[PDB]
Amino acid sequence: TKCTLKSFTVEKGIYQTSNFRVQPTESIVRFPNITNLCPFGEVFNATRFASVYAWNRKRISNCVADYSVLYNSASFSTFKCYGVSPTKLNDLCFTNVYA
Amino acid sequence: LTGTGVLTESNKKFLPFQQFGRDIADTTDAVRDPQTLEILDITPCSFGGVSVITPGTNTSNQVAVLYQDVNCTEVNVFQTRAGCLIGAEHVNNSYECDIPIGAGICASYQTQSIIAYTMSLGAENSVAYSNNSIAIPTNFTISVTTEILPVSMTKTSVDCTMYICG
Amino acid sequence: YTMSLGAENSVAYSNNSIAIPTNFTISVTTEILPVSMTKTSVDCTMYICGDSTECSNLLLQYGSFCTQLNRALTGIAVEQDKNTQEVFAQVKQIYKTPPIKDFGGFNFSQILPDPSKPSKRSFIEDLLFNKVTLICAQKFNGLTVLPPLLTDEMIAQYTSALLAGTITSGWTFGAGAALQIPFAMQMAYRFNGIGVTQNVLYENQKLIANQFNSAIGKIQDSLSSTASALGKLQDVVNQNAQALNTLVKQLSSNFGAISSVLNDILSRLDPPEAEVQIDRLITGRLQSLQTYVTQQLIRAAEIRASANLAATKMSECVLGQSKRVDFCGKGYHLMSFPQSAPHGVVFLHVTYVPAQEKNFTTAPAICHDGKAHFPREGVFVSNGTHWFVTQRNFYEPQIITTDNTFVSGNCDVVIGIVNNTVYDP
Amino acid sequence: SALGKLQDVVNQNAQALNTLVKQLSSNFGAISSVLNDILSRLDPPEAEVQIDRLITGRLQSLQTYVTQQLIRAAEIRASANLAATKMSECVLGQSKRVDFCGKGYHLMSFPQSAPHGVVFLHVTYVPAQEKNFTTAPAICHDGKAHFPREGVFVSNGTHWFVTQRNFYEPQIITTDNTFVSGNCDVVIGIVNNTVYDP
Ligand SMILES: *[C@@H]1O[C@H](CO)[C@@H](O[C@@H]2O[C@H](CO)[C@@H](O)[C@H](O)[C@H]2NC(C)=O)[C@H](O)[C@H]1NC(C)=O
Ligand SMILES: *[C@@H]1O[C@H](CO)[C@@H](O[C@@H]2O[C@H](CO)[C@@H](O)[C@H](O)[C@H]2NC(C)=O)[C@H](O)[C@H]1NC(C)=O
Ligand SMILES: *[C@@H]1O[C@H](CO)[C@@H](O[C@@H]2O[C@H](CO)[C@@H](O)[C@H](O)[C@H]2NC(C)=O)[C@H](O)[C@H]1NC(C)=O
Ligand SMILES: *[C@@H]1O[C@H](CO)[C@@H](O[C@@H]2O[C@H](CO)[C@@H](O)[C@H](O)[C@H]2NC(C)=O)[C@H](O)[C@H]1NC(C)=O
Ligand SMILES: *[C@@H]1O[C@H](CO)[C@@H](O[C@@H]2O[C@H](CO)[C@@H](O)[C@H](O)[C@H]2NC(C)=O)[C@H](O)[C@H]1NC(C)=O
Ligand SMILES: *[C@@H]1O[C@H](CO)[C@@H](O)[C@H](O)[C@H]1NC(C)=O
Ligand SMILES: *[C@@H]1O[C@H](CO)[C@@H](O)[C@H](O)[C@H]1NC(C)=O
Ligand SMILES: *[C@@H]1O[C@H](CO)[C@@H](O)[C@H](O)[C@H]1NC(C)=O
Ligand SMILES: *[C@@H]1O[C@H](CO)[C@@H](O)[C@H](O)[C@H]1NC(C)=O
Ligand SMILES: *[C@@H]1O[C@H](CO)[C@@H](O)[C@H](O)[C@H]1NC(C)=O
Ligand SMILES: *[C@@H]1O[C@H](CO)[C@@H](O)[C@H](O)[C@H]1NC(C)=O
Ligand SMILES: *[C@@H]1O[C@H](CO)[C@@H](O)[C@H](O)[C@H]1NC(C)=O
Ligand SMILES: *[C@@H]1O[C@H](CO)[C@@H](O)[C@H](O)[C@H]1NC(C)=O
Ligand SMILES: *[C@@H]1O[C@H](CO)[C@@H](O)[C@H](O)[C@H]1NC(C)=O
Ligand SMILES: *[C@@H]1O[C@H](CO)[C@@H](O)[C@H](O)[C@H]1NC(C)=O
């Protein structure tokens, strides 16, 4: 009360100082149980790539995507994520990924 | 999708293509558990303001705490419509309101400790009404009372250019 | 259509004609006034930055834009409680009517508190409370509703004390100590207060009591039938509700950010851009909260004007008899009775209204012996042959004597003077 | 504390000003609350955005202060109108409005200046010592009903007098205290007595 009124002496009354809120007791993390790794290798290490005018699209689904292997590698000269942060990619689930 | 709150069994009927619900405030209201096909309703866990009923440091340093609009089971304890009061004794006697808590409950400092009571509106006084009885004064008093009214403020002026861009 | 201003009616004015009432009606009209708003309270941090340390740290860069909103809302709440205390708590003691209702034929059973009722509220109070009427969302985004200091039963007790004081003592209980007086005598004083001699009440006591009872019954039926009568109070409530509802829907706006959900931003982006998006959200939500608080301030100023008016009315209408025209119902004011209502008060204004009138031939003065005679209190009238002197508001003709009239001057100065006989007792 | 109201006003205004001043210490999302540091540290293209942030924040603070001042000045103007009405009807005259000029029947008022306010000394009349008397709405003398011209009939047990309502001063009932009307078959509660004729 003293620090919310900014006075070493506070006269009688009822003063609102702060807000009481319960704190979480346990941390719950939920995800679907899928084991197979996403076949990123067949995309980045593909022997042949399609011409830009006919850019290839691959559907990535029903797999675990360890994006760290991608953004911790030194093999890429440009890595730019728009609307997402690459570090956060390990804590997100996507609808249906396309490469 | 991260957040904090209480998860409870829901009675919502999610469609197969819907993952999570939403509230009018566009905040998530319910979710589908990714491993068990069950709908969990999300309710934010209890919160509310905290007020410090104090008799004033001039007379004492003892204070009572009012948690607003919460149940005492959730926080010398007293439950009132205003909330949960801790550090004040509940007294059946009634007095004039000194520090208003709410819902007809006021707190004071009396012999010492802080007490919470149901404020008294006034002294009960039945009028001796009768169809042939009048009450006429035989004497009077000339009373001088004081009425204070504000009439003006301080004529403040702000130099906006110097305030924003001194 | 071009709206009409009212029924056309000329007045048959002429320099020697007066229209005097020959009958009256006791009318109980109703006047509703809001007294207090809903004691809202907003959690600035939880509304803007619900359960997020990073958002709270970004928010505290704006300084005191949160604490002063809470200060303003607490001021509003204290103002509402003061409003209620001003309007209702104007009686030092708590009076009670006697067990026997020997009020000269007047029947207050429909406005006096019901002893068996669950809240000591009268029938009409129950009707009022039953004619005036999503909360989880509000109470999850930091918004909450504080309870008023005076519970509704305490307000009912206050109104019952005021009503009993008025009934059993007239206006005396407002000035000093309550002085009992038979109700018929009180009504005689009120009639004298409106320029009607007190014999009129005693000669029509049964009729006047019946008229008052019928008016109270009509008030009961009107309240039980038409809810919109209490619109004002309802309107207040509705306004507040809308405010809060809006204040919640503004949590769904992006305000330029990538998403209106804080958790999505905090989960998808790192601080260097998350804090930009959260700054956008904080600015938008803080602007919304400031707008809400300004609206609350304006509406509380309005409600404070209304509460001051209601307190003035309770002082000069219930606790006394007001001579101010149309301040206590159309017609001449006899008395008023308060009634509690959700966030407001309802006055029953008992007023005296002339009903049946007759044209008489009048005269400013009568010339008897060269001297001019004027009426001490009243007016000279003539039914065609004889000249009487009556009171202005009720045709009660009386022979003209030296006690009804006073002499001043002579007949050569007054314009319109007539000749007649002034009888000497 | 008697003059609390006036003091309160002052306090409120002060708080506003204080708040306003403290708003100068807020970054409002900029990199520093100090304008000169922003100017000296960043390049003009981005220092311009930072100073725009500061300008928006400080302008919003000023707007909030001005709006609050407008509302408080409307409050103070309502109060000043009430005080002017009280001075007109209370000091310059004698009001018959109940509780408008102090509890009790109003006699007069005296103004007194005060810092940003006025103080009325309301001199009023308050009945103190009250007695129970039997009463009647009229008295029946010769078949006619007599009502008091200005007052009420009272009885100390044996005799009937007519007294003014607000001060017990019994006087013998005479044809100069009372006026005649109708007959004794109408008034509910009429009593028998003698109307003395001077
Ligand atoms: C009316 O009340 C006043 C006081 O309110 C009475 O005056 C007192 O009279 C006694 C003796 O007569 C004195 O001892 C007191 O000092 C007086 N008080 C004041 C304030 O002057 C007065 O006597 C009362 N009159 C009647 C008829 O009861
Ligand atoms: C004055 O008006 C009242 C109506 O308010 C009259 O009372 C009615 O009188 C008629 C008979 O003429 C009865 O049938 C009604 O039942 C009465 N109504 C009520 C409410 O009592 C009264 O007679 C009128 N008096 C004069 C002298 O005109
Ligand atoms: C005052 O009016 C009430 C009605 O508002 C009267 O109560 C009625 O009394 C009769 C019997 O006399 C019952 O048959 C009714 O059912 C009652 N009505 C209600 C609504 O309860 C009351 O009697 C009247 N007072 C007097 C003294 O007659
Ligand atoms: C009222 O009476 C007076 C006197 O009784 C009348 O005055 C007379 O008027 C006539 C006509 O002008 C004169 O001849 C007389 O000399 C007047 N008498 C006196 C004593 O001055 C007056 O006209 C009468 N008015 C009415 C309306 O009847
Ligand atoms: C009621 O008042 C009257 C007059 O004020 C009293 O009558 C007088 O009483 C006194 C005694 O104090 C006698 O000396 C007078 O002779 C009485 N006057 C007459 C005309 O008889 C009367 O006594 C009072 N009664 C009571 C019960 O107090
Ligand atoms: C692609 O090849 C590199 C080196 O041969 C290997 O480190 C990587 O794991 C492979 N798969 C990818 C990049 O998905
Ligand atoms: C995944 O979880 C569900 C329910 O928790 C279970 O029925 C299923 O067998 C699990 N799948 C695997 C591969 O463990
Ligand atoms: C508060 O708790 C009491 C008993 O613990 C219970 O009866 C009451 O319903 C609770 N109120 C709320 C609002 O949860
Ligand atoms: C107060 O009253 C309640 C019932 O009204 C009773 O249960 C309680 O014991 C009382 N407490 C004291 C201290 O008298
Ligand atoms: C009085 O005279 C006017 C003359 O036009 C008439 O209209 C009116 O009805 C009369 N009043 C009554 C009560 O008859
Ligand atoms: C007027 O009243 C008097 C007395 O009341 C009566 O003698 C006379 O006949 C009345 N005249 C008319 C026209 O009513
Ligand atoms: C009223 O006016 C008429 C003229 O219209 C006049 O003849 C008459 O004397 C006047 N009467 C009075 C009492 O003024
Ligand atoms: C009047 O009489 C009633 C009951 O008889 C009593 O309670 C009251 O105190 C009396 N008033 C005075 C002023 O003596
Ligand atoms: C008062 O009531 C009693 C009984 O109820 C009755 O005898 C008496 O005549 C009444 N007096 C008046 C003035 O009404
Ligand atoms: C009053 O006197 C009349 C006669 O003048 C008589 O008829 C009546 O009964 C008396 N009433 C009382 C209450 O004495």
mmCIF file of C-alpha atoms in Angstrom, chain C residues 6-100:
data_model
loop_
_atom_site.group_PDB
_atom_site.id
_atom_site.type_symbol
_atom_site.label_atom_id
_atom_site.label_comp_id
_atom_site.label_asym_id
_atom_site.label_seq_id
_atom_site.Cartn_x
_atom_site.Cartn_y
_atom_site.Cartn_z
ATOM 1 C CA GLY C 6 -50.918 18.295 -29.713
ATOM 2 C CA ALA C 7 -54.672 18.838 -29.738
ATOM 3 C CA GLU C 8 -55.675 22.343 -30.787
ATOM 4 C CA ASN C 9 -57.670 24.176 -28.115
ATOM 5 C CA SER C 10 -58.343 27.906 -27.860
ATOM 6 C CA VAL C 11 -59.081 29.533 -24.492
ATOM 7 C CA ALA C 12 -62.295 31.555 -24.159
ATOM 8 C CA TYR C 13 -60.551 34.589 -22.706
ATOM 9 C CA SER C 14 -62.516 37.714 -21.804
ATOM 10 C CA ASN C 15 -62.015 40.572 -19.383
ATOM 11 C CA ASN C 16 -64.896 39.559 -17.066
ATOM 12 C CA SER C 17 -64.906 35.746 -17.107
ATOM 13 C CA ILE C 18 -63.104 33.232 -14.893
ATOM 14 C CA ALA C 19 -63.111 29.431 -15.054
ATOM 15 C CA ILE C 20 -63.145 27.964 -11.557
ATOM 16 C CA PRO C 21 -62.890 24.240 -10.747
ATOM 17 C CA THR C 22 -65.838 22.528 -9.095
ATOM 18 C CA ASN C 23 -64.157 19.151 -8.519
ATOM 19 C CA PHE C 24 -60.688 17.654 -8.307
ATOM 20 C CA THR C 25 -58.744 14.437 -8.776
ATOM 21 C CA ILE C 26 -55.885 12.968 -6.755
ATOM 22 C CA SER C 27 -53.320 11.694 -9.258
ATOM 23 C CA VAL C 28 -50.319 9.523 -8.403
ATOM 24 C CA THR C 29 -47.724 9.826 -11.160
ATOM 25 C CA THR C 30 -44.422 7.981 -11.403
ATOM 26 C CA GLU C 31 -40.913 9.369 -11.906
ATOM 27 C CA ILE C 32 -37.889 7.114 -12.424
ATOM 28 C CA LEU C 33 -34.329 8.306 -11.837
ATOM 29 C CA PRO C 34 -31.039 6.394 -12.096
ATOM 30 C CA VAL C 35 -28.820 6.725 -9.034
ATOM 31 C CA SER C 36 -25.764 4.508 -9.569
ATOM 32 C CA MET C 37 -23.946 2.604 -12.302
ATOM 33 C CA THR C 38 -22.348 -0.836 -12.094
ATOM 34 C CA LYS C 39 -19.169 -0.767 -9.987
ATOM 35 C CA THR C 40 -16.888 -2.069 -12.715
ATOM 36 C CA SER C 41 -13.180 -2.741 -12.242
ATOM 37 C CA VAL C 42 -10.684 -3.607 -14.977
ATOM 38 C CA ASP C 43 -7.368 -5.422 -14.538
ATOM 39 C CA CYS C 44 -5.157 -3.407 -16.880
ATOM 40 C CA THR C 45 -2.243 -5.852 -17.043
ATOM 41 C CA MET C 46 -4.377 -8.985 -17.382
ATOM 42 C CA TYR C 47 -6.579 -7.379 -20.033
ATOM 43 C CA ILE C 48 -3.691 -6.073 -22.139
ATOM 44 C CA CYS C 49 -1.158 -8.836 -21.398
ATOM 45 C CA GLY C 50 -3.115 -11.792 -20.029
ATOM 46 C CA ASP C 51 -0.681 -14.194 -18.343
ATOM 47 C CA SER C 52 2.500 -13.164 -20.153
ATOM 48 C CA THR C 53 5.670 -11.913 -18.463
ATOM 49 C CA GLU C 54 7.209 -10.551 -21.679
ATOM 50 C CA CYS C 55 4.081 -8.595 -22.591
ATOM 51 C CA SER C 56 3.923 -7.200 -19.049
ATOM 52 C CA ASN C 57 7.552 -6.061 -19.248
ATOM 53 C CA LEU C 58 6.838 -4.388 -22.590
ATOM 54 C CA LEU C 59 3.680 -2.802 -21.148
ATOM 55 C CA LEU C 60 5.476 -1.280 -18.161
ATOM 56 C CA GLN C 61 7.463 0.807 -20.664
ATOM 57 C CA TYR C 62 4.347 2.980 -21.099
ATOM 58 C CA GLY C 63 4.532 4.115 -17.468
ATOM 59 C CA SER C 64 1.406 4.938 -15.476
ATOM 60 C CA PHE C 65 -1.109 4.298 -18.283
ATOM 61 C CA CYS C 66 -2.412 1.335 -16.232
ATOM 62 C CA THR C 67 -2.501 2.549 -12.613
ATOM 63 C CA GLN C 68 -4.413 5.732 -13.474
ATOM 64 C CA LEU C 69 -7.163 3.785 -15.256
ATOM 65 C CA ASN C 70 -7.650 1.747 -12.077
ATOM 66 C CA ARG C 71 -7.616 4.981 -10.070
ATOM 67 C CA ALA C 72 -10.321 6.460 -12.309
ATOM 68 C CA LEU C 73 -12.489 3.344 -12.052
ATOM 69 C CA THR C 74 -12.148 3.272 -8.257
ATOM 70 C CA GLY C 75 -13.141 6.935 -8.214
ATOM 71 C CA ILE C 76 -16.203 6.022 -10.280
ATOM 72 C CA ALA C 77 -17.148 3.243 -7.851
ATOM 73 C CA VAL C 78 -16.727 5.476 -4.793
ATOM 74 C CA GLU C 79 -18.814 8.096 -6.605
ATOM 75 C CA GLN C 80 -21.590 5.543 -7.169
ATOM 76 C CA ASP C 81 -21.630 4.558 -3.500
ATOM 77 C CA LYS C 82 -21.706 8.245 -2.543
ATOM 78 C CA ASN C 83 -24.593 8.719 -4.993
ATOM 79 C CA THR C 84 -26.618 5.987 -3.316
ATOM 80 C CA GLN C 85 -25.838 7.357 0.152
ATOM 81 C CA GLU C 86 -26.827 10.867 -0.961
ATOM 82 C CA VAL C 87 -30.147 9.769 -2.435
ATOM 83 C CA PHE C 88 -31.301 7.279 0.180
ATOM 84 C CA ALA C 89 -29.405 7.850 3.452
ATOM 85 C CA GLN C 90 -30.984 11.219 4.250
ATOM 86 C CA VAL C 91 -32.851 9.928 7.331
ATOM 87 C CA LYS C 92 -31.030 9.877 10.664
ATOM 88 C CA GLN C 93 -33.176 7.105 12.180
ATOM 89 C CA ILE C 94 -35.073 4.060 10.929
ATOM 90 C CA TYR C 95 -38.796 4.588 11.452
ATOM 91 C CA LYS C 96 -41.521 1.944 11.372
ATOM 92 C CA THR C 97 -45.261 2.231 10.872
ATOM 93 C CA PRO C 98 -47.543 1.152 13.740
ATOM 94 C CA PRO C 99 -49.251 -2.254 13.504
ATOM 95 C CA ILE C 100 -52.632 -0.535 13.004
#
